[PDB]
Design a protein around this ligand. Structure first.
Ligand SMILES: CC(C)=CCc1c(O)cc2oc3cc(O)c(O)c(CC=C(C)C)c3c(=O)c2c1O
Ligand SMILES: CC(C)=CCc1c(O)cc2oc3cc(O)c(O)c(CC=C(C)C)c3c(=O)c2c1O
Ligand SMILES: [Br-]
Ligand SMILES: [Br-]
Ligand SMILES: [Br-]
Ligand SMILES: [Br-]
Ligand SMILES: [Br-]
Ligand SMILES: [Br-]
Ligand SMILES: [Br-]
Ligand SMILES: [Br-]
Ligand SMILES: [Br-]
Ligand SMILES: [Br-]
Ligand SMILES: [Br-]
Ligand SMILES: [Br-]
Lengths: 115, 112, 112, 115
C-alpha cells in the first residue's frame, strides 16, 4: 500500500471516522486530474487508494473534507478542507502515510515517507 | 486589517521570514481568482493583504510557498505548499502556520 | 520582556483568555522552585513574568492549567496541564501553546 | 495493551526511533513515583509499558526524552522533554494511545482514548 491516510479528532480523542477525501494528480496541462478517493474507516484510516503501478511520479493533492466531517457532527468549523500537496516518487517508489489531526479552527498534517 | 498571516519555523524557533504567499478567491465557476499576495516580514507577518470593503463573504485560499522557504535554507521538504482554504463569514482573521519540513499546522484566530 | 507566553484555543478560534500558569526554575537538588505566575489576558498573552536580571540561565518549566480552562467552558479534556520545560541559554523567548481538548502543541520563538 | 506511545519526527518524515521515555504515577503524598519506562522501536512505537491490572486509576506523567533524541542526532533543541500528564481510568479501564510529533523548537501531542 503506497499511499495511506490517517485522520484523528483532537476534540474527541478518537480516530476521525467516515472522513471523505479526494486525491488529485497534476496533469501535463497543469490541471488537477481526479486520481483516487475514499473515506476513513473506524480506525480513522484509508487504505487501498492506489497501487504501486498506478502511483507514478507526479504532484499529488489530498483534499480531506474536514468541513463535512465537523458539520455532520453539528460543529461549524473554519476550514473548507485540509489540503496536502506533495511530489511523490521522484527518486523512485516510496510509501507515504499522511496523517492529519483535526480541530474546528486548526489542523496539523505530517507525512511519514518510507523506502 | 481584516486578514493577517503569521508564519513560524519549528526547526529554527524563529519567525519564517520572506515566505511568499498568494491569496485567491473562489469565483462563481469554481476557479480560483487571484486576490492578494505578499511575503512575510522580519516578524513572520504579512499585513495589508486586503481592506474591509474588498474582503466580502466568500471562499478564500491562502497558498503559502513553503517549498521555496525550505529550499532557500538548504533543506528538502515534503509539501509543495501549505494551503489554507476557508469561508469568510460576516456573522478580523489571523491565519497562523507553523512549518516543519515534513509537517505543518495551521490555525485561525477570528476576533473583534 | 525576556519571557512571554501566548495561548490559543483551537476549538473556538480565539485567544485562550484567563488561562493560569506557573513558571518554576529547577533548583540544584532537582526540585522545582516557584519563579513566576499569572493568567493570560484578553489577547491570550501573559507578559511581565520576569526581568532580564532575574531570568538567568537554567532549566524552567511552564505549567499551563489547561484543565481548568476547558472545565470553565464546560468541556472535559484529556490533560491535567500542559508543561513546557526548557533551558534558557545566553548564547527574548516567546512560548506559544495551541489547545484542543485532547491535544496541544507548543513552540518557542527565540528572537533578538 | 492499555497504554501505548507513538513518536514521529517532523524534520525527517519518519518514526522517531530509540526515543526514551519514563512514565510516573502520582502517589498519595503527591510525589511522582516511577511507573514504567522504555524506548520506541523502529516504527516509533512503545508497547508493553504496563498491564491492565497494574494500570489503575491515577494521574500519570509520560516524560518523553526529546532533548536526548535530538542531541543524538546533533540537533540542539529547545525543550528538555515533552511531558504528557493525564488522569487515567477514572470511569473504568480505557486504552490510551499517546502520540507526539517532534520538531527541534516545537512539539504536538494528542491522545486517542478507546473503550
Ligand atoms: C508508517 C509509520 C512508521 C508511521 C505513520 C503514522 C502512523 O502509522 C500512525 C500515526 O498516528 C498518529 C496518531 C496521533 O494521535 C498523532 O497525533 C499523529 C501525529 C500526526 C499529527 C500531529 C498531524 C500520528 C501520526 O502521525 C501517525 C503516523 O505518522
Ligand atoms: C516573537 C515572534 C517573532 C513570534 C512569536 C509568536 C507570536 O508573537 C504570535 C504567535 O501567534 C500564533 C498564533 C497561532 O494561531 C498559532 O498557531 C501559532 C503557532 C504556535 C503553535 C501551533 C503552538 C502562533 C505563534 O507561534 C505565535 C508566535 O510564535
Ligand atoms: Br470533491
Ligand atoms: Br470500517
Ligand atoms: Br473550496
Ligand atoms: Br502544485
Ligand atoms: Br498553527
Ligand atoms: Br493570533
Ligand atoms: Br498533576
Ligand atoms: Br528520567
Ligand atoms: Br525494533
Ligand atoms: Br528537567
Ligand atoms: Br501529536
Ligand atoms: Br492512534
Amino acid at each position: 500500500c503506497p499511499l495511506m491516510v490517517k485522520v484523528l479528532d483532537a476534540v474527541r480523542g478518537s480516530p476521525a471516522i467516515n472522513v471523505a477525501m479526494h486525491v488529485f494528480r497534476k496533469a501535463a496541462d497543469d490541471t488537477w486530474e481526479p486520481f483516487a478517493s475514499g473515506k476513513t474507516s473506524e480506525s480513522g484510516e484509508l487504505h487501498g487508494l492506489t497501487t504501486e503501478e498506478e502511483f507514478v511520479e507526479g504532484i499529488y493533492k489530498v483534499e480531506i473534507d474536514t468541513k463535512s466531517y465537523w458539520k455532520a457532527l453539528g460543529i461549524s468549523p473554519f476550514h473548507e478542507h485540509a489540503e496536502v500537496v506533495f511530489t511523490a516518487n521522484d527518486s523512485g517508489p516510496r510509501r507515504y502515510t499522511i496523517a492529519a489531526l483535526l480541530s474546528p479552527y486548526s489542523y496539523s498534517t505530517t507525512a511519514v515517507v518510507t523506502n
